[PDB]
Design a protein around this ligand. Structure first.
Ligand SMILES: CNC[C@@H](Nc1ncnc2c(C(N)=O)cccc12)c1cccc(F)c1
Length: 307
C-alpha cells in the first residue's frame, strides 16, 4: 500500500499556486523520487480545473515516452493528491539557459529535436502541450529532455489563438516551439512587452525581428513557425512533427539514434549523488521541506506496472 508516510521529504524543488514538489526518499527503499502535491481544496471547486488535474493524471499514466516524465506512484488523502514522478536531476531547461547563456545552433538543435519527437508522440495521442516555455521542460539525469507539464505564469511562448481564446489545434505547439527556439538562440522570447498587455498586443501584431547572426536555416525555420495564421505554420500540415523535422535546420539529426538516446547531450549534468540537487534554483532548495497540514478523485491511486 501507498501513503505519504512511505516517503521522507528531503528538499523543496518547486512551488506552484495549487501546490509543491518535494524531493523525497522512499523509505525501492532509498530510491529518490519527486513528489508533486496538489491541494484538492483549491481544485474541486472549479470544474475546468479538476478536469485539467485529472487529464494530467490520465496522460501521465497512459503515455510512456523517453521525453515525457514518468508517473511511478499516485495517491490521495483527505485533502491532498500525490503524484510520484521519476526525479529529474537535470533541472529545468530554464536554468540550463541561465547556466550556459545563449545556446549555439547545434546545441539549440538537439533540444528542439527531442522536444519535436515529444510533441509528435503527443499529437498522435490527441494531446496538445499548449505552452513550451523553458521551465515547462526538464532534463533527466543524463541530460535529455522531459516534457513535464500536463496539469494546471508567463505567456510569451503561447500562440495568438491560445491567448485570444479563439479556438486552436495542435499547431499552437509548433508556434510555441519557434518561440522556444528563438529564446535559445537570442536569449529573449520573440515578442516581449514592458508588461502583460504590451506583450500580448506585441504577439498579435506579430512582427518578427531576426538577429543578423542567425544562420539561413535557423532564420528560415523560425519564419515558418512563428506565423500568425496557424494554418500556415510548418508542422500544421498532416505531417505534423515529421514536417518540422524534415526542414534543413535539422539535417544533422539522426532521428532513430536521437530517440534511442544515443546522441550525446550538448551538456552533461555532473551530479555527485543520487539526490544531488545542484541543478535546481536555490530559492526553492533552501526552504525547510514541509507538507502543510466531495471526493470525485476516486480511483486516483496508481502503481506503474514497472515497479
Ligand atoms: C516544471 N514545471 C513546474 C512543475 N514542477 C515539476 N513538475 C514535474 N516534475 C518535477 C520534478 C521531477 N519530477 O523531477 C522536479 C522539479 C519540478 C517538477 C510544477 C507544476 C505545478 C506545481 C508545482 F509545484 C510544480
Amino acid at each position: 500500500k501507498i501513503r505519504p508516510e512511505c516517503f521522507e521529504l528531503l528538499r523543496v524543488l518547486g512551488k506552484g499556486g495549487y501546490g509543491k514538489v518535494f524531493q523525497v526518499r522512499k523509505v525501492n527503499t532509498g530510491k529518490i523520487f519527486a513528489m508533486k502535491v496538489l491541494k484538492k481544496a483549491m481544485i474541486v471547486r472549479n470544474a475546468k480545473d479538476t478536469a485539467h488535474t485529472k487529464a494530467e493524471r490520465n496522460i501521465l499514466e497512459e503515455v510512456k515516452h523517453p521525453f515525457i516524465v514518468d508517473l511511478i506512484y499516485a495517491f490521495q488523502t483527505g485533502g491532498k493528491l500525490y503524484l510520484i514522478l521519476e526525479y529529474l536531476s537535470g533541472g529545468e531547461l530554464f536554468m540550463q539557459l541561465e547556466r550556459e547563456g545563449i545556446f549555439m545552433e547545434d546545441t539549440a538543435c538537439f533540444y528542439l529535436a527531442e522536444i519535436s519527437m515529444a510533441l509528435g508522440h503527443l499529437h498522435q495521442k490527441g494531446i496538445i502541450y499548449r505552452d513550451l516555455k523553458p521551465e515547462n521542460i526538464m532534463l533527466n539525469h543524463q541530460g535529455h529532455v522531459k516534457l513535464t507539464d500536463f496539469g494546471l505564469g508567463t505567456i510569451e511562448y503561447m500562440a495568438p489563438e491560445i491567448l485570444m481564446r479563439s479556438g486552436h489545434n495542435r499547431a499552437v505547439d509548433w508556434w510555441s516551439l519557434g518561440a522556444l527556439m528563438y529564446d535559445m538562440l537570442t536569449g529573449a522570447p520573440p515578442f516581449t512587452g514592458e508588461n502583460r498587455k504590451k506583450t500580448i498586443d506585441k504577439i498579435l501584431k506579430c512582427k518578427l525581428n531576426l538577429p543578423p547572426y542567425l544562420t539561413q536555416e535557423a532564420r528560415d525555420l523560425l519564419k515558418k513557425l512563428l506565423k500568425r495564421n496557424a494554418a500556415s505554420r510548418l508542422g500544421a500540415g498532416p505531417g505534423d512533427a515529421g514536417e518540422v523535422q524534415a526542414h534543413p535546420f535539422f539535417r544533422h539529426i539522426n532521428w532513430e539514434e536521437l530517440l534511442a538516446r544515443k546522441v550525446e547531450p550538448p551538456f552533461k549534468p555532473l551530479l555527485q549523488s543520487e539526490e544531488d540537487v545542484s541543478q535546481f534554483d536555490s530559492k526553492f532548495t533552501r526552504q525547510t521541506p514541509v507538507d502543510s497540514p466531495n471526493q470525485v478523485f476516486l480511483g486516483f491511486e496508481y502503481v506503474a506496472p514497472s515497479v
